[PDB]
Amino acid sequence: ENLSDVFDIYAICACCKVAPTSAGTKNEPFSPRTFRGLGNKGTLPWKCNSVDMKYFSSVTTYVDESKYEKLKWKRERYLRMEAKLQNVVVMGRSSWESIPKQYKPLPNRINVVLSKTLTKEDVKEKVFIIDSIDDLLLLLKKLKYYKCFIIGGAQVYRECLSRNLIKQIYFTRINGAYPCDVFFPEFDESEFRVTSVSEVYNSKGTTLDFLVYSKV
Ligand SMILES: NC(=O)C1=CN([C@@H]2O[C@H](COP(=O)(O)OP(=O)(O)OC[C@H]3O[C@@H](n4cnc5c(N)ncnc54)[C@H](OP(=O)(O)O)[C@@H]3O)[C@@H](O)[C@H]2O)C=CC1
Ligand SMILES: CCc1nc(N)nc(N)c1-c1ccc(Cl)cc1
């Protein structure tokens, strides 16, 4: 069976173009993947993009009650053989720490932070602290939710793609070049097909679009 399908594990990210460097061995002016920039110095490479922000918020928050029973059954079945509704959002520690206190935990979604060092003692926000992907799966198996969104960062995307635990990738392309030090991990793209390509959008002069890739 495909766990990414049974537990509806999707990834959502936004990547921009990478700003060249005149020094160092990391300049890739000819990179085969134009949009691969994820972060810089612990924060996003670009300045507040309200357009992607709204998009991100809608995707990760939207739930359809009518479609849940079907998911409930699909899961009850898998679990059988193995033996307010909200989506889950999963993020690495650095990502969680990069979010300003006032915006955490992300409202209307069940928050999960992956970390082997954070403790419930110092993390007062309502969030599940998970020690590993393995434990993440243990959590989803005993949790009522709609879809599970992996929202970052690079390390977390890598682990999930590497384990073939991603069913869909919601990929925002930011058409701007900014300095970057964290990039989207490479994986076998032949395993996916683009299933949604939005019209172009504009943020203060910078264009961007939204793509969705679904596993074959
Ligand atoms: N453009 C985009 O869409 C996104 C950009 N970002 C950007 O990416 C950068 C942060 O990403 P990155 O550096 O990859 O870090 P992450 O945000 O993934 O956090 C890394 C930390 O998460 C924890 N972690 C990772 N995997 C596991 C695991 N399997 N089990 C338990 N804990 C785990 C560890 O915490 P610990 O050390 O406590 O164990 C780890 O050091 C920032 O610059 C941020 O702004 C982040 C998300 C999305
Ligand atoms: C709004 C930015 C954004 N847009 C998209 N399309 N995907 C994401 N995963 C994020 C994101 C970045 C950093 C953190 Cl910490 C959490 C989420």
Number of Cβ within 10 Å of residue 159's Cβ equals 17
Of 36, 156, 160, 211, which is best to mutate to test ligand 1, by the most ligand atoms within 8 angstroms of its C-beta?
Answer: 156
By C-alpha distance, which of 210, 212, 154 is closest to 187?
A: 154
Method: X-ray
Full residue range of the structural domain in which residue 142 is found: 1-216
Strands (E), 61-107: 87-92
The one-letter amino acid at 101? K
Please state the domain count of the chain.
1
Strands 87-92 and 148-152: parallel
132: closest CA among 163, 86, 166, 106? 163
| C-beta separation of 137 from 7 below 8 A | yes
Q: How far apart are CA 92 and CA 90, in angstroms?
A: 7
For residue 57, is it left (φ>0), alpha (ψ between -120 and 50) or beta? alpha
CA 12–ligand 2 middle distance (angstroms) = 7
- Residue 184: strand, helix, or coil: coil
**Resolution in Å, one decimal place:** 1.9
The closest of 177, 216, 210 to 196, measured between CA atoms, is 210
Question: Is residue 52 within 6 Å of ligand 2 at its C-beta?
Answer: yes
- Asked if 52 and 163 count as a contact pair (C-beta separation under 8 A), the reply is no
The CA 205 to ligand 1 mean position distance, Å, reads: 29
CATH number, domain containing residue 106: 3.40.430.10
Nearest to residue 174, comparing CAs of 40, 42, 61, 63?
40
Residue 81: Cβ within 10 Å count: 8
Which sign, positive or negative, has the C-alpha torsion 186, 189, 190, 191?
positive
C-alpha distances in angstroms, 114 versus 18, 150, 171?
27, 10, 21
160 lines ligand 2 (CB under 6 A): no
Q: Taking a C-beta distance cutoff of 8 angstroms, is the pair 211, 198 a contact?
A: yes
DSSP assigned state of 190? G
* DSSP letter for each residue of 48-67: --HHHHHHHHHHHH---GGG
Q: How many Å apart are CA 214 and CA 168, to the nearest integer?
A: 4
Q: Cα–Cα distance between 86 and 147 in angstroms, integer?
A: 8
Breaks in the chain (C to N > 2.5 A) come right after 83
How is the chain split among helix, strand and coil, in percent rounded to 5?
30, 30, 40
Beta carbons of 46 and 16 less than 8 angstroms apart: yes
